[PDB]
């Protein structure tokens, strides 16, 4: 027999991810490189595997939508929400959404569509939002300028606490 | 940091359900006397105690539905999936739905809405699928015929592990 599992999370190392749709913002090239340095943040620190499907069905579906797009989290146009993602499970579970009515970049204007998604994607791992203010699962986007993108220990623990940490090296 | 909770079991041993709406295939006689079956297979076996509202939410909302039905769990038409039950928790945690594009019934052609329901309502109080080819908690339909009811072993194991003996 078997019992569900204590917490929210994806029984498999390897996951699937295929991106539906593109922003009018950017090359297909740019989404592609952001999506791909966001999944790697969090394959980094744990033993998650993430592979790229052109088509079918696939863990994590990523799709640009407005207004009402398929659920029951409705985009509201330009400003106020962003995107969201379904937590771990069935079907629409893990799935990432973009509210295309807001204005993607990979610079520091709009809003930098690696970091969304590196935070989305927490959550279609399996991570809620974090208190500590400067966590990438914090709630309230706060670009810092710097560079460099290090996951902070916040995250690292909160991922860690689900999948383990994979090669610690 | 903060992960999602999962209500591994019941915080309680008396739970609710309502009947919502009603299978074509079957008299209303007929499917109360199914599900009244399906949930005294868990409280045989557990401290558990299960009863009907007419109304109002229950703990475990049932209801019959086809296609998109209010979830987006799409049902599939005939075939494929019979039905689907959500793990403990509030809301929607617990209800179970059953696709009415299936033909049930209880002595006459079609899936046994008695068994799948047991089945079911196993999800709705915490069990995934079991590996047990004869299990209650596999995951392929297996009617064997029998006219009475037994719980397989395993079940029992799997329940009790969550609940304890009644
Ligand atoms: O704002 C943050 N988290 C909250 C949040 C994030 C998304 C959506 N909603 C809420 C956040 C921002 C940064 C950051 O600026 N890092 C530098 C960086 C950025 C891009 C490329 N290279 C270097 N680090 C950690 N957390
Ligand atoms: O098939 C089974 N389990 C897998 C399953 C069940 C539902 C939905 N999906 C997958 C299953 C079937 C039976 C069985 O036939 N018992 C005789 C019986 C049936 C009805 C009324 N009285 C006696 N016993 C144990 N497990
Ligand atoms: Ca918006
Ligand atoms: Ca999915
Ligand atoms: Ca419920
Ligand atoms: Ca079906
Ligand atoms: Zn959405
Ligand atoms: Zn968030
Ligand atoms: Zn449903
Ligand atoms: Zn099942």
Do not use: C
Not at 43 to 65: C, E, K, Q, W, Y
Not at 121 to 147: E, N, Q, R, V
């Amino acid at each position: 027999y078997n019992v569900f599992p204590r917490t929210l999370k994806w029984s498999k190392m390897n996951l699937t991810y295929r991106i539906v749709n593109y922003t009018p913002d950017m090359t297909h090239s740019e989404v592609e490189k952001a999506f791909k340095k966001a999944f790697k943040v969090w394959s980094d620190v744990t033993p998650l595997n993430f592979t790229r499907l052109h088509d079918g069905i696939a863990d994590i579906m990523i799709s640009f939508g407005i207004k009402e797009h398929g659920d029951f989290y409705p985009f509201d146009g330009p400003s106020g929400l962003l995107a969201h993602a379904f937590p771990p499970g069935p079907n629409y579970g893990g799935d990432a959404h973009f509210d295309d009515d807001e204005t993607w970049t990979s610079s520091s204007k709009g809003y930098n569509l690696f970091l969304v998604a590196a935070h989305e994607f927490g959550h279609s791992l399996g991570l809620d939002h974090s208190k500590d203010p400067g966590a990438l699962m914090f709630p309230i986007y706060t670009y810092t300028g710097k560079s460099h993108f290090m996951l902070p220990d916040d995250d690292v623990q909160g991922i860690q606490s689900l999948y383990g940490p994979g090669d610690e090296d």
